[PDB]
Each structure stands twice: as C-alpha cells, then as structure tokens.
Amino acid sequence: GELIHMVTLDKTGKKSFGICIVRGEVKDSPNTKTTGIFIKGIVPDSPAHLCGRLKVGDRILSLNGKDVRNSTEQAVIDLIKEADFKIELEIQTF
C-alpha cells in the first residue's frame, strides 16, 4: 500500500538536507510505467536521516509547492539550493 504525505526538513545546523536523488521509473499497473524523482540515498545524521519519515525509494512529487514529477535531477537540486533552511516535500511512499 502506497501513500502520499508531507515531510518538512530543516537543515539548520547541518551542511545539507542529506538526500541524493535520481530519475527513475516504477511499473504502475499491470502494462504501464511512471517516471519520477526518487530518493536514492540518505546521508547519515543529516536532517533527512534524523527525520525518520523519508525512505530510500520514496518518490518526490513536489518541493515547496513546485511540481517535480517530470523534472531533471539538476532542476530539483537547483530548487533545493534556492531554498533557505527548509524544504517541504510531498512524498509518495511504500
């Protein structure tokens, strides 16, 4: 069972949010596939890690209200770097 939920990360006092992402695809069916931005790695002791509500394999649907379903990896990274100390992520998990 999957679920879309919201996760806010605050990197105050940390070097970065701690997420590494990649463009990926999963088969939503049985005869179709969906593409998107997925969390490929999480940095230990980073906000993403300490949060505990973000998992490797989760897909990022939006960032601070911006749809990133079809964004390039670099575009999402730029968006994150343009943010202050916080980013609100719409996450699809499980």
């Binding site: 997420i19 790695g41 670099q74």
Partner: peptide, 5 residues
Amino acid sequence: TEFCA
C-alpha cells in the same frame, strides 16, 4: 554520487 543536497 551526483545530485545530492
């Protein structure tokens, strides 16, 4: 690993 923030 590229694309981390």
